[PDB]
Amino acid sequence: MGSAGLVSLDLPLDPLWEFPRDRLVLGKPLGEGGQVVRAEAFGMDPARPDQASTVAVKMLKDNASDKDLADLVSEMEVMKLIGRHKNIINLLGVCTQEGPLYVIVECAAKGNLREFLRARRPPLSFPVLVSCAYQVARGMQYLESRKCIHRDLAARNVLVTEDNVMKIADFGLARLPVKWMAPEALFDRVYTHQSDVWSFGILLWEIFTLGGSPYPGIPVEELFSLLREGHRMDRPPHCPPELYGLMRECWHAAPSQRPTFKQLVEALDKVLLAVSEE
Ligand SMILES: Cc1ccc(C(=O)Nc2ccc(CN3CCN(C)CC3)c(C(F)(F)F)c2)cc1C#Cc1cnc2cccnn12
């Protein structure tokens, strides 16, 4: 029971990824933009065929165009090439043949990182916050090694499992993320790994403000003019200068002066180690 666009595209059966439609029972909605719904999957680990699993399933709406289908097909194929990693949301399967296009991934029980942090504000220990930042750094390092540029790294686009494992995702634009973007991305529309490093800096600031909104008070129209005078966000409350140093390094105007994701993984591991020692 597929749409007119999907029948026209006539996608092939990928034997590594095609999962049976009848072994998937849809449940509660998780997110909207397409839409994400929670589902029960049976035999998603094919060695254990009768074993039940909770998954997340992305799909188009009834009022979706052919361009929206092409984007979801484009999203499907990008996720195949990236590969399995601890800190990327794992593709589990797809449904393409006998109905609407479904893109299946693992369900992160605690939701997105922004709502995770905001929900646990005081009326989250320091090692947990450093672990979050470190894990996102490791995910982005993996992305870069796969020659993959995210373009919209933010707390909303990181998912959190039951065990507080960070899973990098992309849900598209929210219902333009100006406050997360490097100058070259905002102004010249040039996206690189180093432009993702800028956004990681803004994500770090989100984590240690417990899901705070960046540049509070300053409207988006006045932001870019303020950036090229050299102004940046101040050190947030209860944040050491070592972590603030990494943020300011991420916000260097020149991309080459910003740290690499390899360097960010190394620096954050030292902070994780320092907070665990005693
Ligand atoms: C069903 C579903 C389908 C797809 C994706 C998804 O994020 N796909 C994705 C597409 C592209 C990219 C990388 N590109 C970015 C653009 N860029 C230009 C090129 C590189 C990546 C990334 F992880 F690599 F970033 C992921 C997530 C879900 C989810 C879910 C889920 C699970 N639990 C919960 C709980 C609450 C809400 N949602 N949810």
From Swiss-Prot:
Active-site residues, record numbering mapped to chain: 152
Localization per record: Cell membrane; Endosome; Endoplasmic reticulum
Tissue: Expressed in gastrointestinal epithelial cells, pancreas, and gastric and pancreatic cancer cell lines.
Ranges per topology, Cytoplasmic: 4-278
UniProt PTM comment: N-glycosylated. Full maturation of the glycan chains in the Golgi is essential for high affinity interaction with FGF19. Ubiquitinated. Subject to proteasomal degradation when not fully glycosylated.
Disease per UniProt entry: FGFR4 variants may be involved in the pathogenesis of various cancers. It has been found in prostate cancer as well as cancers of the breast, colon, head and neck, larynx, lung, skin.
Function in brief: Tyrosine-protein kinase that acts as a cell-surface receptor for fibroblast growth factors and plays a role in the regulation of cell proliferation, differentiation and migration, and in regulation of lipid metabolism, bile acid biosynthesis, glucose uptake, vitamin D metabolism and phosphate homeostasis. Required for normal down-regulation of the expression of CYP7A1, the rate-limiting enzyme in bile acid synthesis, in response to FGF19. Phosphorylates PLCG1 and FRS2. Ligand binding leads to the activation of several signaling cascades.
Quaternary structure and partners: Monomer. Homodimer after ligand binding. Interacts with FGF1, FGF2, FGF4, FGF6, FGF8, FGF9, FGF16, FGF17, FGF18, FGF19, FGF21 and FGF23 (in vitro). Binding affinity for FGF family members is enhanced by interactions between FGFs and heparan sulfate proteoglycans. Interacts with KLB; this strongly increases the affinity for FGF19 and FGF23. Affinity for FGF19 is strongly increased by KLB and sulfated glycosaminoglycans.
Protein name stated in the entry: Fibroblast growth factor receptor 4
Organism for this UniProt entry: Homo sapiens (Human)
